[PDB]
Design a protein around this ligand. Structure first.
Ligand SMILES: *[C@@H]1O[C@H](CO)[C@@H](O[C@@H]2O[C@H](CO)[C@@H](O[C@@H]3O[C@H](CO)[C@@H](O)[C@H](O)[C@@H]3O)[C@H](O)[C@H]2NC(C)=O)[C@H](O)[C@H]1NC(C)=O
Ligand SMILES: *[C@@H]1O[C@H](CO)[C@@H](O[C@@H]2O[C@H](CO)[C@@H](O)[C@H](O)[C@H]2NC(C)=O)[C@H](O)[C@H]1NC(C)=O
Ligand SMILES: *[C@@H]1O[C@H](CO)[C@@H](O)[C@H](O)[C@H]1NC(C)=O
Ligand SMILES: *[C@@H]1O[C@H](CO)[C@@H](O)[C@H](O)[C@H]1NC(C)=O
Ligand SMILES: *[C@@H]1O[C@H](CO)[C@@H](O)[C@H](O)[C@H]1NC(C)=O
Ligand SMILES: *[C@@H]1O[C@H](CO)[C@@H](O)[C@H](O)[C@H]1NC(C)=O
Length: 377
């Protein structure tokens, strides 16, 4: 029973909130620019944290490495029971890792066990006694970290270069027009010739940024991952318990010096990995923000080419209805059918508190309808 004259006034009223979107849209672009530039500075101060943290880690590693070379100058095994535990440690390790890879991981259990037995035969129980596995598994982790930062940093600096060049345009500089509440908003006269350069630069930055199941990957990569399971086997934790204090007191002291430097180096390596993980998030954030910037610029452009025609309503209200009229409508809402930019009719649901005698009725309808329209492309 809604008068056509009212539907027309709703169309007049709703069409004027389309011009507020073009303004809001440009602000969304400029607000995203702020967040990207904010994250960029947070990345830089994080990089300065990594450069301080790298030195401390590196110094701790040279002291650890300086310690293991002095323990290889004295390479003999003190107890001769060690040599007999080695040939009962080795078979046990092979089985516990094979059993793991088959149960937890995948196929190739025997392949892993073979690669391990071969390496353990080219190995000695002294290497175990001096925690030689932990030294190697730390020095390699240190190199993986150095590589990860090298890659991430160079991906980031390229994208940051493309982005800073894009943000040197004055389209992104805040203007008073963005805050006008009574006077209308107007895009630049040459937006069609600014759209494509910008969008491509956002695409180029998105490209630049683009880079237990964990143990299974490692055991597949190198069978030495099995040596994380020394604890499970008895003879091996006994090789590690051997006191050489009576037999070779000089070896025992150097081993205690190494273990000290080892724990420090590991602490500072876990600290570096947490900063690296924080840097990774800044990288993902920036990729997430660039995707928004793309969707926002398209929305501005989409709005721009659709609103240049003033011959008919931007938003035309076709029907208003309630649970009285349709009765398929839910009870506490009214449904407004809308033809936005002469596209397929969009249906909007607004609660009766905003529907009945509310001046923010058509502001709600228009904002909702435009949100749906935006989703459609
Ligand atoms: C790494 O070195 C060890 C040395 O202990 C190799 O294990 C040894 O392998 C030989 C032959 O492969 C075994 O000899 C056989 O023993 C059985 C039962 O004792 C006997 O019936 C056979 O006639 C033969 O004498 C030996 O026992 C075994 N020792 C241990 C402690 O396992 C191992 O094969 C080497 N790894 C590689 C990849 O070569
Ligand atoms: C060689 O190693 C064995 C074990 O690795 C040592 O045996 C230990 O001896 C003490 C003293 O009798 C016992 O209390 C421990 O329980 C033994 N450990 C094990 C695992 O059996 C042995 O003392 C070492 N020999 C030398 C000369 O250091
Ligand atoms: C440890 O060696 C690395 C590589 O040469 C170097 O970066 C670091 O400064 C060294 N630390 C010390 C204390 O010499
Ligand atoms: C596995 O690790 C050992 C020592 O950590 C190394 O000598 C060997 O080359 C590694 N193998 C592979 C395939 O990475
Ligand atoms: C952004 O970074 C923070 C910490 O740097 C992280 O907690 C958050 O998950 C990141 N968000 C995205 C979308 O990557
Ligand atoms: C808007 O229309 C122009 C052509 O008039 C076109 O080049 C541009 O890609 C359109 N933008 C969107 C988001 O559809």
């Amino acid at each position: 029973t809604v008068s056509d004259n009212e539907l027309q006034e709703m169309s007049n009223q709703g069409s004027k909130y389309v011009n507020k979107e073009i303004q809001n849209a440009v602000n969304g672009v400029k607000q995203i620019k702020t967040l990207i530039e904010k994250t960029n500075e947070e990345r830089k101060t994080l990089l300065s944290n990594l450069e301080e943290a790298k030195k401390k880690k590196e110094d701790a590693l040279n002291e650890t490495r300086e310690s293991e070379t002095k323990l290889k100058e004295l390479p003999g095994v003190c107890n001769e029971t060690m040599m007999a535990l080695w040939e009962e440690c080795k078979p046990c390790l092979k089985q516990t890792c094979m059993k793991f890879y088959a149960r937890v991981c995948r196929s190739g259990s025997g392949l892993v066990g073979r690669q391990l037995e071969e390496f353990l035969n080219q190995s000695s129980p002294f290497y175990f006694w001096m925690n030689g596995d932990r030294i190697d598994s730390l020095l390699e982790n240190d190199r993986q970290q150095t590589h990860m930062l090298d890659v991430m940093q160079d991906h980031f600096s390229r994208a940051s270069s493309i982005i800073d060049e894009l943000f040197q345009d004055r389209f992104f500089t805040r203007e008073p027009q963005d805050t006008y509440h009574y006077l209308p908003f107007s895009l630049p006269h040459n937006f069609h010739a600014m759209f494509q350069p910008f969008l491509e630069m956002i695409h180029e930055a998105q490209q630049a940024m683009d880079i237990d199941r964990t143990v299974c990957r490692e055991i597949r990569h190198n069978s030495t991952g099995c040596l994380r399971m020394k604890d499970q086997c008895d003879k091996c934790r006994e090789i590690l318990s051997v006191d050489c204090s009576t037999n070779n007191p000089s070896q025992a002291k150097l081993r205690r010096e190494l273990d000290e430097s080892l724990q420090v180096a590991e602490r500072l390596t876990r600290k570096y990995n947490e900063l690296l993980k924080s840097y990774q998030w800044k990288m993902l954030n920036t990729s997430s923000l660039l995707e928004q910037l793309n969707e926002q610029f398209n929305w501005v452009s989409r709005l721009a080419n659709l609103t240049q025609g003033e011959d008919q309503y931007y938003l035309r209200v076709t029907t208003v209805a309630s649970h009285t009229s349709d009765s398929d409508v839910p009870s506490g809402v009214t449904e407004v059918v809308v033809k936005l930019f002469d596209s397929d009719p969009i249906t909007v649901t607004v609660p009766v508190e905003v529907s009945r005698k509310n001046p923010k009725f058509m502001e709600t309808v228009a904002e909702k309808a435009l949100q749906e329209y935006r989703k459609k492309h």
